[PDB]
Write a protein that binds this ligand. Structure first.
Ligand SMILES: NC(=O)C1=CN([C@@H]2O[C@H](COP(=O)(O)OP(=O)(O)OC[C@@H]3O[C@@H](n4cnc5c(N)ncnc54)[C@H](OP(=O)(O)O)[C@@H]3O)[C@@H](O)[C@H]2O)C=CC1
Length: 456
């Protein structure tokens, strides 16, 4: 079936480094003052035991690229840089993407490019990813580093080493494989180190649900960005599925363009539709919105399509910039999560993107918000709550390998994902023979080592 050929998911498979062959030269360890000291010591011994001189690089939160550029031009020749900025980092209230490590990672990268160090950067994160459903993502925002990290790898390979996640508060794994990781020939740049081995991130095709389970829309279904392109198609799908009542929300709401014939089109399909103006970044507006739902038709599902798009390059991106532009997607999701955590929802669907699934040049500023969604969904599942972060491909990078999918087909793939209870399904139509060549044009990857069509 066409739908079953658009389904993919992320898995972590056991793998190896490829012989450490020791190191040489001087490595820098970037960290904040009085933070990640235990891990820094574990990293130092790991690197020094491999035959390298380690020096610390104490970074001041949100210092900027200019300051780091001057300091990197004084250290002299550098063999590599290990970033521990995301280690022992507290979650940022109010704005999750205001993470200092996100802003400073970008600053470090840009600075490394300016100082022309000519060496790769390796970023360590703590419990930022889950190798299995039994592991919990500690801070969903840390996922943004992996998201933007993937794009930086494609735009400036020479300066990007990779990403390594280790158990929060733990150092044993790091000081045990770090050496082999930074000096490996496997080409693994996306790894998770656990007490029971090393794992590598991999794309794999998803299986069909032989289960009788079939998600069905009941009561009221809320769709953010309902008046937008994607939210509109989702609404049409729900109506065709037999959804009783649809609540479409956006900042424009009833004033949105095309909203008029939108309701008429949905009501024609047999669904009572209501369009309301609501800014999902405003927690109070959302609370009032939810509170206005008829007791006769309780909210049962949420589809969060609200968002914005850009196209800036990594050298033009700043943590502040990213945080500000991804508010509807990120804050909208957080608010909806907090305000429905008590409701009896059957589905809570966040609209993620291929931008975070594998990332692409120019999408560096878009990847962060989508990665956060992936993490939030996994956190909800860990707490016994429903959630699905669907990484969407293009909806009908054309010749880049990704083929736009028909609205109808895309929604049936999602239906199938809800039926199998997949937390982070990837729904995209691509031609691997064309995609792979472009994705590894200047940088190889093992991300697609299990994709049949990637080996065929
Ligand atoms: N952009 C692209 O080319 C692609 C995007 N995607 C995916 O599809 C998703 C949906 O976007 P799309 O369908 O293009 O929609 P649109 O491009 O039409 O944008 C919809 C607009 O959505 C609503 N909105 C924005 N911010 C808020 C907010 N703070 N509160 C409430 N609603 C808000 C608004 O409606 P109003 O005007 O009424 O205020 C807003 O003007 C993306 O986020 C992404 O995951 C997939 C392939 C390509």
């Amino acid at each position: 079936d066409e739908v079953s050929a658009l389904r993919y998911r992320i898995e972590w498979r056991p793998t190896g480094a490829g012989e450490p062959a020791r190191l040489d030269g001087t490595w820098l360890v970037a960290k904040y003052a009085g933070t990640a000291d235990e891990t820094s010591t574990a990293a130092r011994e790991a690197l020094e035991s491999a035959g390298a001189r380690v020096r610390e690089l104490v970074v001041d939160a949100r210092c900027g690229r200019d300051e780091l550029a001057e300091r990197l031009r004084s250290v002299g020749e550098v063999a590599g840089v290990l970033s521990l900025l995301a280690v022992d980092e507290a979650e940022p209230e109010e704005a999750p993407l205001a993470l200092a490590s996100l802003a400073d990672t970008l600053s470090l990268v840009q600075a490394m490019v300016s100082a022309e160090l000519g060496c790769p950067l390796w970023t360590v994160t703590e419990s930022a990813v889950a190798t299995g459903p039994f592991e919990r993502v500690r801070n969903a925002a840390h996922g943004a580093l992996w998201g933007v990290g993937r794009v930086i790898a494609l735009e400036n390979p020479a300066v990007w080493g990779g990403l390594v996640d280790v158990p929060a508060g733990s150092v044993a794994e790091l000081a045990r494989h770090l050496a082999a990781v930074v000096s490996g020939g496997a080409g693994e740049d996306q790894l998770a180190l656990r007490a029971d081995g090393v794992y590598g991130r991999r794309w794999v095709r998803a299986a069909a649900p032989a289960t009788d389970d079939e998600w069905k829309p009941t009561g009221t279904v809320l769709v953010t960005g309902g008046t937008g392109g994607v939210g509109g198609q989702i609404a049409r799908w729900l109506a065709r599925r037999g959804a009783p009542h649809l609540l479409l929300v956006s900042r424009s709401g009833p004033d949105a363009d095309g909203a008029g014939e939108l309701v008429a089109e949905l009501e024609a399909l047999g669904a009572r539709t209501t369009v309301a103006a609501c800014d999902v970044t405003d927690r109070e507006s959302v609370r009032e919105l939810l509170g206005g739902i008829g007791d006769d038709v309780p909210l049962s599902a949420v589809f969060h399509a609200a968002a914005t798009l850009d196209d800036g390059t990594v050298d033009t991106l700043t943590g502040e910039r990213i945080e500000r532009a991804s508010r509807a997607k990120v804050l909208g999701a957080r608010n909806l999560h907090e305000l429905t955590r008590e409701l009896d929802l059957t589905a809570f669907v966040l609209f993620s993107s291929f931008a975070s699934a594998f990332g692409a040049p120019g999408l560096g500023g878009y990847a962060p918000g989508n990665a956060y969604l992936d993490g939030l969904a996994q956190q909800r599942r860990s707490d016994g709550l429903p959630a699905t972060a669907v990484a969407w491909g293009t909806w009908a990078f054309r010749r880049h390998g990704v083929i736009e999918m028909p609205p109808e087909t895309a929604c049936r793939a999602l239906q199938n994902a809800l039926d199998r209870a997949e937390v982070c399904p990837i729904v995209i139509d691509v031609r691997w023979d064309r995609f792979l060549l472009a994705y590894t044009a200047q940088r190889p990857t093992r991300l697609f080592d299990e994709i049949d069509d990637a080996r065929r």
